[PDB]
Amino acid sequence: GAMGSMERASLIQKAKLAEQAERYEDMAAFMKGAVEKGEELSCEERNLLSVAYKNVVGGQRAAWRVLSSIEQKSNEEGSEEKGPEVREYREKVETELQGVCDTVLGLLDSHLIKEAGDAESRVFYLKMKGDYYRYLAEVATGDDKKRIIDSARSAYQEAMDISKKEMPPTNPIRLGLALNFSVFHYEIANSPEEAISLAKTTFDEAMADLHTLSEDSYKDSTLIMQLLRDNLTLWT
């Protein structure tokens, strides 16, 4: 790895600098380097890794959607033939996106998940695994699409099972997992009723546990609860 000669602490320091500079590709490369040092990641470090790749892949997804929309319009009736370029360029962005997802999934598999024993780390990583398979599913159109979808579902489900056993219903990781698994159901698995049920139950169980929280924990939890409500409003 190109980061093999840099100290772990220096990689972390630079990831934080990259974040301040909105240099998310750099941030992701620094955090990949840090992961490849082989030590477990702290809570803060795990969130640097997730922020970095979320921003990188988020940009790719947004571009893919623009290009996919243009390509779809080109295959409508009465659309003039413009040649292979739209498809080629959509494929280029798609391949880059798939590469980033495979990189993240590779980090999780080698060896973040297997060393993650505490619920907060294990659920965090399994949520990421579900998320990055979900992004692969968004662009999948071939013979492996069902298997990609099932890989997302399996990771989310393992995360859900651990989170329900080991975390309070207001835990932000548990809430964010549920938010995203609900979106998986709606947007990927063609299961809007499951999506709505999950979001509602998650919201209601969190509401009932808010009384146990400090002011700062309350603020954190209610932010994600509002996202659940926002999705429910979109879907009903």
Binding site: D131, L179, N180, I224, L234
Partner: peptide, 5 residues
């Protein structure tokens, strides 16, 4: 598009 985190 729906909210994810």
């Amino acid at each position: 598009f729906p909210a994810t985190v």
